[PDB]
């Protein structure tokens, strides 16, 4: 479940999450997400997935 | 504490008869006084507590060359209250005499009323202002209710006369009275008589009958006011605890209203907080700004929402205000009333102080001194003059007036530092 | 927050200040010019700073503690202080 | 985003009542508005989400002098919409001028839906070109959405009026109608009356109760056009970005649809394909040549397959098309909706600009100018009469129908450099 909904949660609803990118603020977006070059990523690892799961994966 | 509740003028009566009626209905009381069958909250503030547990409302009705109050007298609801507080022109200052003459009985009614509450918070005031009758002698009894008690809070609630023209004489009498309700009063609750006639006539269809329809509105605004003290929850549920948020200063007190459905006979509270920051919602009408926000919520709430409803209306910056200082929102919550069918139980309310008002005020300021211009609509009353045989009070509330404005657009400015 | 110290030992201070304001306004109905406006002063400027120095240290991690910042923070007041 | 739904004359509000009803059925919504026991999937563009989790159509039904509208209201499914959207001479003139002293409450209907909706994307009309009462007033409506909404989107559905003749005026409607959608329409989406009577006489064996069956027809397209919307993936999931690929050009907006099973009640992908690309599964009637193909699959695929029948089928060059650019065929996947019994699971949908319809369009502009040249067959209708007493806005209708035929013979031609 965890590992479907990750690569659901980046790479519907993304879309509207760029599209206020598009036209500053990191805690704006979170806020209009709940309901071109660079950018910083953050999504917290549970543990008993962390044990299969990898940090790296997440730059991959 | 325990409030007492004064009522004059004929808009005044009436709401003051559909506010007891709406809170004798609202409680588990009969209108004999009887404690209903079905009958946990508080009735201890304007309700004294007899004989037969029957809650008799705390009211002193002020009239003089009644007419309403003989359709007040033949109704199954006159025998709620009146334990005998009922004591028997339309100019200012004939009012101002008349009162005078008579202050000593009614002094010594209130004096009574005052014995027999065993605690005392506060005078709240059934007011019209330039309803003929009720002013002056509402400026009157004011005056000499702030001289008497110096140790008691004063609310009014009033409406502000404007129907878009009538009488040539009626600012005059409404400036007067101003300058009486700026000084002699701790707390003012404004209303609007257009702005309200015209939410009536968009959310129905009717043009004449606004009276009954209004009364409906104010009694509904007043006791949402009142809930949580009238339910008892455990935020400010004192007078005094409430009114020291919402006055910022003591030349500013006056209290903008709103009510979140404007008809109500499932939304979340996100949408009804976006729906009162819209001004369809308020009921009183350079950019204008808030100095501080109330908003009390009583409905089906689930406490996390509200947090995370802050957060994103908060974000989102429909708060169109820019204070000079750290002024913000303030939230709070109140119970859902029993016994009352209510569809979309949630249900809010706003007090916000804005300075949008003063231009409303500066209608009446251009109004009074282009009469007051041209001289022909003084029309010469003789209780205005050897009330005044110079007419300077007019000046004199002239003057506290302009000095009210400029203390309004010095609050405007970003700092306060500077007066005006 | 009384298991953080340092905040802990600033909001003493918050509630400090304002007792002796209240003890000192009470006094003269007229106004302070026999130093009771020389400690005001003083109070203000120590009162902005501390307010401005735990609000910083503040921003535990829980909803509602994270939204009573952001109500002095409309306007960043204490963050522009 | 959010889209809202107009619909009027009598088969367009046939077609609004099929397609919601198969939209209830198609979604877990009982139809009193109730969701169902067993409901995911997105109800947030058409259905308002209520009070009990009620899914009330975003629609507005527009009517005058109401036949059908009296069968709408005795129906189990005159609960799951109506929130009283609805509101109650078959020339194109004649619609106007009632639509003309009845704009203000029925845009007044619509800022009231704007203002209920929180996000808005389009309006999407349900109309029937000629229809009497629908032609002028539908016309007349699309003018004034354009005016007033100049950030939405405007979608047409409606039918051309061709059954072999019947009514000698309708020509002169049809046209002006036409001039009012390629000015005051952003994308059309065109259909034949006589090419789906055809296909209803051939797959089954009625002549008469063709309505019946042609309702199912444009419903299933509909729905299928929207599918990937309501049934949400992520490929062209609004429909600006899926708008955006079928125009090539403002002059040329008119969509040819299609529908792979004309009975579906398990061949591969690759079959289907081939199926499409014949014309007896199109729906819509030198050589004409599609400028922009698209196509969507809603079934059970295999991903590869449609790589390896992109292949084939481009090698098999069974695209009849020659562009004067690079303009290709472009796939796109949708979901298979559950609850709903399918045989042959595998369901397709096109859309594709294809210059043949020029010549439909061109039918009309010879009978017009046939019946024009006789001149007995205006017939002198007093509503044409007092709105264009020179009747020059026909002649003005046929300027811009012939710039249209002009710019499509100009789209023909291997360069699009040259215009028409």
Not at chain 2, 108 to 119: F, L, P, Q, V, Y
Not at chain 2, 243 to 248: G, V, Y
Not at chain 2, 256 to 272: F, H, Q, S
Request: proline share 4%.
């Amino acid at each position: 479940e965890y590992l479907q909904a990750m690569r659901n949660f980046f790479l519907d609803t993304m879309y509207d999450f760029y599209t206020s990118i598009f036209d500053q603020n990191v805690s704006f977006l979170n806020v209009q997400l709940q309901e071109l070059d660079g950018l910083t990523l953050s999504y917290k690892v549970p543990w008993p997935v962390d044990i299969v799961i990898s940090l790296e994966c997440q730059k991959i | 504490r325990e409030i007492i509740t004064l009522q004059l003028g004929q808009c005044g009566n009436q709401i003051g008869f559909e506010f007891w009626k709406q809170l004798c209905a609202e409680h588990g009381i009969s209108p004999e006084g009887i404690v209903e069958e079905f009958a946990t909250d508080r009735k201890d503030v304007f309700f004294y507590q007899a004989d037969d547990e029957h809650y008799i409302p705390r009211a002193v009705l002020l009239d003089l060359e009644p007419r309403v109050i003989h359709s007040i007298l033949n109704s199954p609801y006159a025998k709620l209250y009146n334990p005998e507080n009922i004591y028997l022109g339309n100019n200012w200052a004939s009012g101002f005499s008349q009162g005078e003459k008579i202050h000593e009985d009614i002094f010594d009614i209130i004096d009574r009323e005052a014995d027999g509450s065993d605690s005392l918070e506060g005078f709240v005031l059934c007011h019209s202002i330039a309803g003929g009758t009720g002013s002056g002698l509402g400026s009157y009894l004011l005056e000499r209710l702030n001289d008497r008690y110096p140790k008691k809070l004063v609310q009014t609630y009033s409406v502000f006369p404007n129907q878009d023209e009538d009488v040539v004489v009626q600012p005059y009498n409404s400036l007067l009275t101003l300058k009486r309700l700026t000084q002699n009063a701790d707390c003012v609750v404004v209303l609007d008589n257009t702005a309200l006639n015209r939410i009536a006539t968009d959310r129905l269809h009717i043009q004449n009958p606004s009276f009954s329809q209004i009364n409906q509105l104010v009694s509904t605004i007043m006791s949402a006011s009142t809930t949580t003290l009238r339910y008892p929850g455990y935020m400010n549920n004192d007078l005094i605890g409430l009114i020291a948020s919402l006055i910022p200063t003591p030349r500013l007190h006056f209290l903008m209203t709103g009510y979140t459905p404007l008809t109500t006979d499932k939304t979340t509270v996100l949408d009804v907080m976006r729906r009162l920051l819209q001004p369809k919602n308020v009921m009183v009408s350079t950019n204008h700004c808030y100095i501080a926000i109330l908003n009390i919520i009583q409905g089906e709430v689930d406490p996390t929402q509200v947090h995370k409803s802050l957060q994103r209306i908060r974000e989102r910056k429909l708060a169109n205000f820019i204070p000079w200082g750290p002024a913000s929102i303030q939230v709070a919550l109140s119970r859902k009333s029993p016994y009352l069918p209510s569809a979309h139980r949630v249900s809010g309310l706003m007090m916000a102080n804005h300075t949008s008002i003063s231009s409303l005020f500066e209608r009446t300021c251009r109004q009074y001194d282009k009469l007051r211009k041209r001289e022909a609509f003084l029309e010469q009353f003789r209780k205005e003059d050897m009330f005044k045989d110079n007419f300077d009070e007019m000046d004199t509330s002239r003057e506290i007036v302009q000095q009210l404005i400029d203390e309004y657009h010095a609050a405007t400015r970003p700092d306060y530092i500077s007066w005006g | 927050f009384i298991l953080l110290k340092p905040v802990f030992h600033c909001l003493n201070e918050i509630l400090d200040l304002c007792h002796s304001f209240c003890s000192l306004v009470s006094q003269n109905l007229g106004p302070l010019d026999e130093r009771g406006a020389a400690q005001l002063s003083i109070l203000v400027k120590g009162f902005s700073r501390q307010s401005s120095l735990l609000f910083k240290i503040l921003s535990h991690q829980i909803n509602s503690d994270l939204a009573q910042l952001l109500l002095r923070l409309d306007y960043n007041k204490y963050y522009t202080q």
